[PDB]
Symmetry: none
Subunit: 454 residues, 2 copies
Amino acid sequence: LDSVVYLRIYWLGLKIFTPIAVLAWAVLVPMRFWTHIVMAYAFTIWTCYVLMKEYETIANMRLQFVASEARRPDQFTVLVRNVPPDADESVSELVEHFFLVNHPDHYLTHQVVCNANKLADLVKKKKKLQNWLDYYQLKYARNNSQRIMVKLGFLGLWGQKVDAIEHYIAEIDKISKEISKEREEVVNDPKAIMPAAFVSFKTRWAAAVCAQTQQTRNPTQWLTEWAPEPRDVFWSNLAIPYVSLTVRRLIMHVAFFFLTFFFIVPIAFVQSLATQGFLPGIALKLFLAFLPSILMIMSKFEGFTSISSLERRAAFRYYIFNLVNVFLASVIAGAAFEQNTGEPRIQLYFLLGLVYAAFWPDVHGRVIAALVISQLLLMGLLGTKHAALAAPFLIALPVLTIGFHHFCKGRYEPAFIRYPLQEAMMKDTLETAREPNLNLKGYLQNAYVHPVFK
Amino acid sequence: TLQDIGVSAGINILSAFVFFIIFAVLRLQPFNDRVYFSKWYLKGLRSSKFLNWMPEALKMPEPELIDHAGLDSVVYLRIYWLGLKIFTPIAVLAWAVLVPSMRFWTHIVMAYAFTIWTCYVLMKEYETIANMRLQFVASEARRPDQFTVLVRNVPPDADESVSELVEHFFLVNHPDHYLTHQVVCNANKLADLVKKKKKLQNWLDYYQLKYARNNSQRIMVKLGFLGLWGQKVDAIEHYIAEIDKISKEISKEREEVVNDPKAIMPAAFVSFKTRWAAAVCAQTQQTRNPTQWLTEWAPEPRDVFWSNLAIPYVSLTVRRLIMHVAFFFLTFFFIVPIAFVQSLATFMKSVIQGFLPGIALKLFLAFLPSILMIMSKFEGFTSISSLERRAAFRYYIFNLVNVFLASVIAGAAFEQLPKTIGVAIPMKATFFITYIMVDGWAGVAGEILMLKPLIMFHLKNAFLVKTDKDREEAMDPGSIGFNTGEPRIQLYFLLGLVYAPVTPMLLPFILVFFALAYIVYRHQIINVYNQEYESAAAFWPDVHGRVIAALVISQLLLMGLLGTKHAALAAPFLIALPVLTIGFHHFCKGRYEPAFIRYPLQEAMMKDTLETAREPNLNLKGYLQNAYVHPVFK
């Protein structure tokens, strides 16, 4: 806000000047390594202190900035995931019994997610295949080309697809009544339901309590969490087989790091040379790809349940990849030759112009990421000296920055929690005073059904 | 040199058997039964071949042992069994492969197999301990800390006192569950004076009994040997006057501390009608402001470190940084004695020159746990269990730096009279075998004698006991000693993992230490060693983290050692081990550590429902309202 505007004037100067100086002055002028390391430490501690002060100011602005919205579902609901299956009771009965025993006199109702897995699959192929047929007919009118992947690539149906219009229309008509009979089945079927649910409480207090606590002696079951907006929930990931989200996120770190390291390799070989046979040209044509969307899909292959979170994670990965390759390699090549939508765009424009001359915690994460990348790549640049033996004393700098980041985590992030207990209770009391004749149950028991299900 | 190893092995086995002979003699003597059997007295269960105790300590399975001692003791005893499980197949595999290109890949596959086995054993053990903890807590008896939460950093106010603030807040924000609260009172001075009066009473009793021994006049001038030139020609009248004046000061202090409002600290122990409500208050963000109304589970009153509840919460970070700096200076200015003991490692004459470094090092580190506990009390932690785990962490870092790397570096340098670590490490296998033997076998077999508590008990009984029914006061067996017992075994883990692929002759010494220490400590836990606090084995995440750190250090050192060979090609294999090990650490962390850091609400509700169905006429408020006052105020 106002403080962000005030501090950005001093902030931009340091931001443009911190990587360029370390790139140029460190290789241009030869007390050599001592000066280099001491200047690096001075800059990194200056940045750390600036972040800490600014982030105290932002936290205080948050505390004074307390205001109200009207009300919404996900102000009362949580997303109980990975409900354990039982042969004797359906998911609805299990959820109801659990939340009547272990959270009594606050639980209101639960809306179990329908077995949308095949449902979401069929809806998604429905939409993408009508779109597919549309622009492919347009393309065939423009450029008559034949595809060799009929919607599956590997193990598609043994058909002909001479028309692909009437056959698909008939399949859609049949699957409509198939969906109808499945709808009739799910109301009494104990296996046509995914293991997840949206649980609604009488109060914000209860939902906050239920979102922050452990629910069972098995931290992989009844895995509770703040529910998204009914428009914002990503219906596919609700019932991932849950192969240990911790493992699922570790795999993402590793795969992303190898992806970026692999993409560094061609540029490294190009710089080393400039210091089958024709397939490299096709590869260079392909390196301009939709890869942003590739990362988005790649994390979508993992589970976050909310479109906002998926977009945030994809944007962060794309940010770090951009800042590494299209910035640091570019500026090092330039040095060798010498010898919240408008905000990221204006960042890119200001960086490009200077080449020739609760979102704030995310911003903090990005700045810390930039500092860590700078430090690690300077590490790689300077490690060429054999038998330096300065490493067990010089390596600590990324570790120190990560320690400071965790200090900031534990010291200021808890100021952006949704509904700490005091606020939830105060909102409850005020709302009850304002609207003492509110049938809350009727209001909150119709959302989180499905976009398809009316 | 193997001859020195054999001679020292003979000497240390001789010392162990001499210790056990002396122990079997002392144990049967009726006039010190109150020492070797100190528990069975604190339970009120007792009153008034020479190695039969070695198998006799193997009765009492883990269920009955858990009931007799506690879960902290039984888990800390499982640490030695963990050592045996990790290092017996490692020892067998190394002795069947690495003892009489190609041997390069043999080494690499050895490192991979050792890490895989270690991680599998850690996973199984950490599951077992998690379930043991959950079962124990579910079955535990009622304690006031199951309902109580320590609220620190209450915000100050112009007119309302601290108690009114706390009551209003927990009435508004936890209705139908908030029961009572007890404020924290800064009574350090009063407690100090009470302790001083106790010391003076001890001296007075000593002198009174001495006078009753011989009819004369004592002349002890204020220090015994070289104090102020007093006479205290009575030396009993002087202490009578001292006790009277200290009692007057105590009475005035008691009157003052109750009515002074600056003696109230901004903290309170708030209690709830149910375990579920306490768990809700102790795990949830209370207010927006991240520093005000901080809540966490409270320690049971026999656990609180009352001296440190009177520290303004703003200054804990300053204190922690100051003690980090002082710990750096300690781990630095302590390089000198270790370089000295390594100088000491320059026919029965020379073998004792191979045996004396162990005792020298053991003697220089004997006063280290006391220093580390003082530094831990400086960063006020408000709980004996937290102080002990903090001190164990610090003393592990101290071992890993000074006892291990400083010894390796200093010894390599002193043999001087790139990566030289590849010859600096395997040359200290002799020193570390000798140190393991001295500080392990002989040290443990000497602990079972309990010389220090035995001597203190006899001294107190001969000089300070005035009547009957006060001996149980002198009986102070102590605890299992996490601070000291745990980092030693962590160091032996680290040595065994580092030297297993390098020189596999280190391991049998460690295995003998693990079996011996297991027997000895099981006997002691059964028979002596009262327990000062009772967490439910909450230290185990720390033990697991430290074993993972030892694995990573071992792997890095191996990579540095074999990085000397031309055309290494080890990086695509030994940069995968620390990464796979850290990934495994994070999987175990996320899957099993919640049992140790969080309290599930279903567990609390089950406990509460069973309790109410069992004892429906319980008056909780009477049980909770007077705990957590202070031991000084009656």
